[PDB]
Amino acid sequence: SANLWERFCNWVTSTDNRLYVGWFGVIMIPTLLAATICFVIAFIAAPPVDIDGIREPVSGSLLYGNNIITGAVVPSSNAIGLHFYPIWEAASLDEWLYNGGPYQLIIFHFLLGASCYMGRQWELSYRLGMRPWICVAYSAPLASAFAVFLIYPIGQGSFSDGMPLGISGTFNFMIVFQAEHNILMHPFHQLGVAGVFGGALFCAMHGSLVTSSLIRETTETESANYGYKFGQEEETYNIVAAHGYFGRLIFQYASFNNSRSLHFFLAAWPVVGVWFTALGISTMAFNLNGFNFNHSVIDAKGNVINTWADIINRANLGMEVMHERNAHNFPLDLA
Amino acid sequence: AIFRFLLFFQGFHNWTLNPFHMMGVAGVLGGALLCAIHGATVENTLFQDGEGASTFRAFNPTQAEETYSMVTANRFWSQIFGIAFSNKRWLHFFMLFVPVTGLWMSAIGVVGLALNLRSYDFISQEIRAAEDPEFETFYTKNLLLNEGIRAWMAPQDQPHENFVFPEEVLPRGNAL
Amino acid sequence: DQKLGANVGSAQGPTGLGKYLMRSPTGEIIFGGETMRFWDFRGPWLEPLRGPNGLDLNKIKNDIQPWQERRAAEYMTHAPLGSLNSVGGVATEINSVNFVSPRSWLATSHFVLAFFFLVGHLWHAGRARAAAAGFEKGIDRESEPVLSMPSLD
Amino acid sequence: MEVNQLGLIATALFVLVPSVFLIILYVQTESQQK
């Protein structure tokens, strides 16, 4: 043995593994298996959770009356707030499942692993001699899970205010968010949708331009795809014909001819936009909300002349006034 | 004036719960992923064709060799995600498909909201909620948010209806 | 309400938990309502009401001082809630009180900066590692590393 | 619970039928000589 540990480190780090278990992986693989395994069981069999700390259990698992669309893993109790609630902090599991213990076990392990997943997206690139930065693209979607699963709760004072782990539970997170922060009227969210809309847009642009300017090498009755062999030397499409068409659609200088500048833009746009969206949720986590133009335009006498901004406020009040029916005892919603 | 269109659809059509709107977002959201992911995969999987750091100039506007290691990219993802492309022709067609299919679905969902044929409720859920007062899902919760949106908005949002909802009729939780 | 003749100690709220005072998970007496999440708050103005078991029902019942009543009122009406255009309050509020807590400004600005810097870290660290080993400008067309490794397929 | 009676068969055939389709092809492709 060249030296066990010496060997171990050579395996772990080996670039010949079907799946690259890296150094970051040694933390990832376990945390992610716990998060996943606990979730699946929760989502299927966990019992009702007193999410709002008011002894009014919300059941969100399949076996307790939910379907895929409604079902979810409910957030830890509000009675718990930001306190750490590891299983060994409960008189029993029965108590742990009631206060939404599974939620923390999941969010913490997931966020932990999903980070290492980033750390790994670097490591492998290193062991392979390729430039880094891919992991930096993945920093955006991660920075969101973080914002939605941890920053917002830290900011708001409780994990019970973090986004639930389920379809409908998410719509809840959204609808309420809007009511308390008026996010649609916040610069950061808008940049977010520009990035997402734009992304999908560009994703379609590139996708089509390229696919449409492929060099013919296939039969009339043969998948146009076969015209490409894994491990080719030259390109499979006429990037000069592509640019030729697109330059004429709009106008030449408003079209890419440099595949490298094209692809940088292609990555830069969504990642930058989502970065802002993530900073939006992380920012409105400290109550710096969207623009409040309520009763701005008023007439010559003082009467209030409504704008669409006001019609938006009514819809928001409906949400405010109805969410968490029994959780409030006082006038102002400061939590 | 578009944000209220959104809020409206939630409140009245409970649009977020619609299978077609979901596909819609899966496509736009998933499309904005391919976009970002493919872009980065290319920029960090490039061959060196220049001596500079700013590798942008190092590009051959006139085809020839692939400007990035398609072979390396394949191995990367094949080891970090488990699955990875290996046919630029397909990888690019996929990129057309995902977001165009998504938007098509989101359309059908709306073509149905025209007739108000929405995906508002789950009957099995409503029936259990009626008989049993302790049954609560994140779904029932939402529907109440809708009631509030409709009741508090309808008045100044549908002027032609000369709505008058006495303070006592307005749904509201405790304190708020 | 205590001045209106209500017995805070035994008041039962909608849920049956305690309109004004309730207990935390470890037994201490705290304020009730959604405010149950902030039972870790300590502050000059509020401490003199705390006992060895948390808020003391006797002090709360006759030791509350005016300077505290107005402190609580001041701070209540100056919570850190506001809009980008500086309109203090909840998103559904009306224009009039132009205010956004310094604590909100500071906290957000610095989370953004703190964040982007973590990206900055990743970016400059990723560059340094490729720069060192030496490939931060591309894969050697000739010696393409991946090409010397066995197929996992 | 109080679900739809045909829901089960609607979901079953919705999965089986097209899956059975693909599978018939893949296997007949897969077994084509040379």
Binding site: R18, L19, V40, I44, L62, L63, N67, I68, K229, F230, G231, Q232 | V71, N74, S78, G82, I83, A84, S86 | S151, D153 | M1, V3, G7, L8, T11, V15
Partner: peptide, 30 residues
């Protein structure tokens, strides 16, 4: 009955995952 149907499909997608990652067509060069 519904629970079973939901879990089954899920279990089927995970099975797919496995086969897709470990039983793909080895990706051949040139």
């Amino acid at each position: 009955m519904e629970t079973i149907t939901y879990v089954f499909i899920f279990a089927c997608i995970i099975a797919l995952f496995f086969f897709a990652i470990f039983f793909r067509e080895p990706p051949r060069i040139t």
